[model samples]
Target chain A: HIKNMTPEICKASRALVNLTQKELALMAGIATPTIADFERGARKPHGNNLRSIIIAFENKGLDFVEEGGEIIGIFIR
Target chain B: NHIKNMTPEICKASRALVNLTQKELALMAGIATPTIADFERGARKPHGNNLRSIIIAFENKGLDFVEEGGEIIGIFIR
Candidate 1:
């Protein structure tokens, strides 16, 4: 959840999943522009779009701030 | 360059991109106005939360290390 919240973490997840920007946007149910904007730090995400990203990454076995207080916030490809 | 040397320009850019004045940024970033000015001029480097705050602030303005120069002008929603 935490990892999915940071732009850095989002980009990392996209890289790890090997999803092109378009593919990831499709999976997250958000506009590709929204994805690009958030990734570029131009738009802050809120509501369902944010929730969807968390769910998608979690389903991919991606943990943002690790389960045991490790504070790791990225998936890094 | 010395880390201090970059703070000023970086801070200035951060503020400019966010459309905040040095004073406003100081209030928001919790540094003194002078300190924010100093940071913008490379007089000092921010530490800890301040550093992270500035980074996040700039990120809020769409500034982060990424592939170079690809501005997102148009996109499609599926």
Candidate 2:
């Protein structure tokens, strides 16, 4: 499982990238509801959709930091 | 400059994650087939531009390899 991807990460990661829910949804090729819900802790995005989200942040220069099954913070690299 | 130390296992993981063959990866990374093959086989660590190139190729697809204790322990999707 993606232990590093918490709702906090969902909110924090894109915050560093300065993206809104709608922009991120378009970038990740996911529905806006998925990004909206994931950030609010209502649901988790699954598989390819999930990968798409990560890759979106990657392209925008967001690096997620994980340690011991927890997301510690965001790194810009 | 952002790429750090990577083991052969990390090399293999990124290749597999992107569904790329060594030949395919060589082409994508602008390295020779023997370079990737040798790196994947643990013959030597990829150096300088070679290392950066390969890591960036996988990075485009969202694979970020993390390091700790002087070794790559795990990966993050973002």
Candidate 3:
């Protein structure tokens, strides 16, 4: 079960990195529609999809914080 | 989507606990060995049957996963 993958967080992270849906999708090795679906909360991404997205963001120096059982945040590190 | 908290650490630790090699686990999980290697190496994430297969493989081996906030907290032998 992938948690804390809210639309807000996904979209915000993309915005922070200034990446378009296509750009992020390309980097993540997933289809653009998949990213759009996840960002719109239309569908939850599978483990691999989520992982790819996170890895792509991380590759660009975005750090995802998941601690203390609270909100998950993204920061440029 | 499958287990989001299925981290590389948890997967590797589970394999070690069972004294299983990556190739062995991949075979049991019904996926290619490269899939397991890529996941363990953080080179790729597995989706679809690949993800389900791996989780089921670990679960069948008596490992219980506890995940939160995109992290694997603990894996207990049940």
What tens digits encode model 2's per-residue C-alpha lDDT throughout A44-77?
6677887788889889876656567565544556
Q: What's the CA error at residue B28 for candidate 1, in Å?
A: 33
DockQ of each: 0.02, 0.03, 0.02
Best by lDDT: 2
Fnat for each predicted structure, in order: 0.00, 0.00, 0.00
Which portions of model 1 miss their true places by more than 4 Å? Answer: A1-4, A66-71, A74-77, B1-78
* lDDT of candidate 2 at residue A65, scale 0 to 100: 61
Question: Model 1 - which docking category?
Answer: incorrect
| Top candidate, metric DockQ | 2
Per-residue error at A73 for model 2, in Å? Answer: 15
TM-score of each prediction? 0.41, 0.47, 0.46
Q: What tens-digit string does per-residue lDDT give for candidate 1 at B6-48?
A: 2343344334334567777666666778877666556777776
Backbone clash pairs for candidate 2 read: none
Pairs that collide in candidate 1 are A3-A64, B8-B39, B8-B40, B8-B41, B8-B42
Q: Which candidate has the top score in TM-score?
A: 2
| Ordered list by lDDT, greatest first | 2, 3, 1
